[PDB]
Amino acid sequence: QLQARRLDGIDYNPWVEFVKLASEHDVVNLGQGFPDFPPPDFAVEAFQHAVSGDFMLNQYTKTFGYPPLTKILASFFGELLGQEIDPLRNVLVTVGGYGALFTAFQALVDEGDEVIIIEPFFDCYEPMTMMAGGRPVFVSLKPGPGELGSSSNWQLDPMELAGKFTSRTKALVLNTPNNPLGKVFSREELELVASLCQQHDVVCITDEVYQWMVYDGHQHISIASLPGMWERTLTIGSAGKTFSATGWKVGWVLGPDHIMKHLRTVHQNSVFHCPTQSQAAVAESFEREQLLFRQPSSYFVQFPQAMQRCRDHMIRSLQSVGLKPLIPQGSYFLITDISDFKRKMPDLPGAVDEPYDRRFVKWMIKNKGLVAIPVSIFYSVPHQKHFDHYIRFCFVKDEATLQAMDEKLRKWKVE
Amino acid sequence: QLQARRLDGIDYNPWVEFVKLASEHDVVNLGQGFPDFPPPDFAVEAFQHAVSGDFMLNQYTKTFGYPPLTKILASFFGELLGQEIDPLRNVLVTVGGYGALFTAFQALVDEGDEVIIIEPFFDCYEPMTMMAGGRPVFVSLKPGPGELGSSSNWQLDPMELAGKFTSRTKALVLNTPNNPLGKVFSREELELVASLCQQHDVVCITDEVYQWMVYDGHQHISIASLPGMWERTLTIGSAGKTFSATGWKVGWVLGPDHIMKHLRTVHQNSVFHCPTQSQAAVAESFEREQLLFRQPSSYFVQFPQAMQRCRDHMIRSLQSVGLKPLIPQGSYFLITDISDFKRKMPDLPGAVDEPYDRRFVKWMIKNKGLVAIPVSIFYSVPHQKHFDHYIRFCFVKDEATLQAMDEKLRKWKVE
Ligand SMILES: *Cc1c(COP(=O)(O)O)cnc(C)c1O
Ligand SMILES: *Cc1c(COP(=O)(O)O)cnc(C)c1O
Numbered sequence: 001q002l003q004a005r006r007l008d009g010i011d012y013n014p015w016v017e018f019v020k021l022a023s024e025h026d027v028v029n030l031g032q033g034f035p036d037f038p039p040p041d042f043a044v045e046a047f048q049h050a051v052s053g054d055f056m057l058n059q060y061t062k063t064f065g066y067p068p069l070t071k072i073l074a075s076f077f078g079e080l081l082g083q084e085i086d087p088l089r090n091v092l093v094t095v096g097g098y099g100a101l102f103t104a105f106q107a108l109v110d111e112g113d114e115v116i117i118i119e120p121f122f123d124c125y126e127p128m129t130m131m132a133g134g135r136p137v138f139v140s141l142k143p144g145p146g147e148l149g150s151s152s153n154w155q156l157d158p159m160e161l162a163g164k165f166t167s168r169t170k171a172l173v174l175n176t177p178n179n180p181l182g183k184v185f186s187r188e189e190l191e192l193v194a195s196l197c198q199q200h201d202v203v204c205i206t207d208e209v210y211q212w213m214v215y216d217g218h219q220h221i222s223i224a225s226l227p228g229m230w231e232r233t234l235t236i237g238s239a240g241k242t243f244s245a246t247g248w249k250v251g252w253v254l255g256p257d258h259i260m261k262h263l264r265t266v267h268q269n270s271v272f273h274c275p276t277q278s279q280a281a282v283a284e285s286f287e288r289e290q291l292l293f294r295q296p297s298s299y300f301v302q303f304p305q306a307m308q309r310c311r312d313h314m315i316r317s318l319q320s321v322g323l324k325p326l327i328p329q330g331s332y333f334l335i336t337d338i339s340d341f342k343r344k345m346p347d348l349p350g351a352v353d354e355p356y357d358r359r360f361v362k363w364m365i366k367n368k369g370l371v372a373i374p375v376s377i378f379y380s381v382p383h384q385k386h387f388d389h390y391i392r393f394c395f396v397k398d399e400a401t402l403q404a405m406d407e408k409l410r411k412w413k414v415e
Numbered sequence: 416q417l418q419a420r421r422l423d424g425i426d427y428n429p430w431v432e433f434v435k436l437a438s439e440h441d442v443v444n445l446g447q448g449f450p451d452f453p454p455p456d457f458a459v460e461a462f463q464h465a466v467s468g469d470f471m472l473n474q475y476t477k478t479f480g481y482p483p484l485t486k487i488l489a490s491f492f493g494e495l496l497g498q499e500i501d502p503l504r505n506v507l508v509t510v511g512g513y514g515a516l517f518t519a520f521q522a523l524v525d526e527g528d529e530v531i532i533i534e535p536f537f538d539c540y541e542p543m544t545m546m547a548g549g550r551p552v553f554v555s556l557k558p559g560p561g562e563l564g565s566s567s568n569w570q571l572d573p574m575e576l577a578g579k580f581t582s583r584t585k586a587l588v589l590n591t592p593n594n595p596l597g598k599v600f601s602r603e604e605l606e607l608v609a610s611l612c613q614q615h616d617v618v619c620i621t622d623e624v625y626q627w628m629v630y631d632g633h634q635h636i637s638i639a640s641l642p643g644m645w646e647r648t649l650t651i652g653s654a655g656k657t658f659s660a661t662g663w664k665v666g667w668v669l670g671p672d673h674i675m676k677h678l679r680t681v682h683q684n685s686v687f688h689c690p691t692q693s694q695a696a697v698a699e700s701f702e703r704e705q706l707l708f709r710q711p712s713s714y715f716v717q718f719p720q721a722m723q724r725c726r727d728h729m730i731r732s733l734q735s736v737g738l739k740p741l742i743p744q745g746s747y748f749l750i751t752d753i754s755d756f757k758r759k760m761p762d763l764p765g766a767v768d769e770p771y772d773r774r775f776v777k778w779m780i781k782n783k784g785l786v787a788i789p790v791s792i793f794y795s796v797p798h799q800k801h802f803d804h805y806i807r808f809c810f811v812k813d814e815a816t817l818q819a820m821d822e823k824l825r826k827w828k829v830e
Contacts, residue, residue: 038473
């Protein structure tokens with residue numbers, strides 16, 4: 001009654017409980033979705049230059065983006081997408097990927113509109129839909145029928161997906177590479193999404209923050225580059241996941257003018273400007289990567305290779321204590337199946353209707369000194385019963401962190 | 416139909432037209448509401464330190480604020496307000512004062528709620544109310560019955576104000592010091608607002624970004640410090656207007672837990688984090704000012720004194736060409752009455768229902784090389800007819816800018 005109705009049912013953050021429990025124990029924290037090592041030297045230096053350069057960078061820049069930033073976005077991403085991008089009509093700088101998602105939902109989603117969300121989903125898609133008055137409609141990726149799983153083998157059933165589309169469908173939210181699963185959507189999968197979006201006249205909100213974090217030769221493909229998709233796609237990126245600097249909180253949306261103008265309305269009536277100097281830092285960092293594009297000294301070549309090693313290390317280490325890793329093709333994350341643990345140890349203490357994975361994670365934090373994230377937080381409440389046996393780890397960590405993880409795991413292995 | 420209905424009627428920005436016209440002429444730009452000189456050395460250095468310190472400052476900080484920042488906010492503003500402020504329950508860091516306003520509206524304003532707005536109003540209060548489904552209700556400050564006006568003499572009629580309150584009133588938006596008028600609300604004025612807010616059970620959203628920019632001995636008083644007001648007030652500040660660094664885009668809201676928790680819900684479902692390093696810079700800048708509080712070497716003492724001189728200079732200069740300055744007691748701004756110009760020059764070219772001041776500003780930009788802002792943009796459409804003879808100047812400018820202004824004015828004076 002004091003508060004607006006749009007806040008109904010979205011006030012709870014399943015995060016807090018675990019972050020609080022982790023802080024009161026000796027732990028290796030693999031639940032945190034950010035690097036615990038520095039960004040690359042060129043990125044840090046770029047920010048250093050922004051706060052010691054033209055003194056006027058301390059003052060407001062342009063509402064829809066620091067023009068050198070929108071310039072390099074339009075040019076670099078224009079090439080990557082095979083699309084002509086105008087900085088002013090087609091690019092909007094936002095407060096991170098979060099802010100870009102929020103701006104898209106607030107622009108397009110209205111009372112009674114349906115939004116298709118693919119499980120497992122980055123958790124904010126559901127409450128952002130709700131706050132905008134929309135109705136979330138869920139479709140599940142399903143693992144196909146060795147011992148190690150693979151994210152590529154989690155399938156989007158064409159018949160199940162087509163059936164979610166109605167006359168009320170406003171948007172489908174596509175996240176690739178996917179958090180938490182680490183799935184990189186194939187060309188054929190995107191074409192399935194694309195053809196339904198075109199058939200039913202639906203906007204595809206595509207969350208591509210992990211674009212550069214792809215492994216084992218897999219290619220990131222943007223759905224907006226597909227025939228006829230540019231006119232119905234919003235593409236989201238994040239400087240923080242791009243340059244390993246999550247605290248910068250700079251993101252962007254790319255899209256056609258007839259859609260983007262509504263995002264600009266939301267922007268101008270919410271934050272109006274993004275900070276100047278961080279934008280300058282991001283622009284300079286992209287100019288560096290555009291200069292060295294495809295070269296062995298580029299961050300976009302070097303970094304994924306280093307993190308693939310971290311991923312492999314973690315897969316072997318966790319595999320070794322009964323956890324069943326699902327090999328991701330992209331992102332910061334892998335999930336492990338804990339089904340074997342649910343069999344041997346079903347009666348873990350917890351609340352009623354509290355999914356096993358949440359109870360397991362609490363158990364692991366207290367007894368084993370390892371933090372992961374229960375995967376059921378990335379599922380609609382109705383589906384959490386069935387998808388209650390996965391936990392998410394982050395492998396984008398310093399060598400010393402993974403060494404500390406190994407120590408915890410060796411101790412665990414002893415009984 | 417593609418876009419959400421909440422966007423109805425809020426897409427137009429009266430700004431663009433003038434910023435575009437100014438850019439295609441030789442001008443002294445006094446329409447810009449930010450300093451064209453550097454922030455103080457300690458502020459710039461604080462940011463420099465943040466991007467060269469602990470490398471982990473490049474990664475996410477806490478959702479509701481960088482803890483050293485919320486700490487100094489709670490402590491310093493706690494003292495200023497005579498209030499005990501808990502960092503976690505009572506402080507929220509936002510993307511500037513803009514973001515803080517937006518967060519407050521989205522948390523509290525719902526379909527059918529009325530919001531009282533005091534004219535002239537910072538222009539975003541109206542569309543933010545509309546986007547949240549609320550109904551703006553307007554009350555006008557009115558100049559009382561020498562040649563130079565005074566912002567202190569613009570009155571809030573107690574009877575007119577009381578009559579705006581209904582059972583649908585959710586919030587009143589109080590901006591002091593006021594942009595564009597430069598009025599600093601007296602204790603008695605705040606008590607009038609306070610007593611009605613308490614009588615009708617209304618939240619006071621108080622925009623106090625210009626808190627430190629007060630002149631001629633006038634005191635900034637926060638309505639939240641008044642008996643019984645803390646429990647129904649949200650107090651907003653902006654690091655950019657505080658430290659002359661508008662591009663930092665760090666702001667905050669202070670308030671009681673039972674209200675703030677709804678703002679936290681909005682925050683967590685919109686941006687989730689604010690950037691880390693700018694927050695660190697702001698924290699260090701406030702620690703500096705708290706250390707030197709009331710001392711002659713403090714920015715909060717030095718800066719207003721310097722800007723008061725700039726204000727006086729501008730008042731004399733503009734007074735000299737027929738413009739009738741209204742002496743502000745606070746803020747970056749003064750307005751001048753252009754009535755004499757409307758008398759001698761009524762038939763200026765423009766669109767139908769285009770207020771005189773908008774036409775005048777266009778004329779002045781093209782012919783006289785000076786930019787100001789038409790004050791009618793800070794009025795509800797119905798009231799723009801009557802309040803069509805004021806323009807807003809910004810005096811927070813480099814000495815050289817004011818010299819250039821004088822040159823333009825001397826040229827003008829010749830016929
Ligand atoms: C981290 C993350 C974001 C948010 O990006 P920021 O730039 O940090 O706001 C958006 N989507 C996914 C899937 C993420 O993992
Ligand atoms: C400039 C201004 C703001 C915005 O503050 P930012 O911190 O720049 O977002 C809010 N209210 C008023 C009255 C202003 O003049």
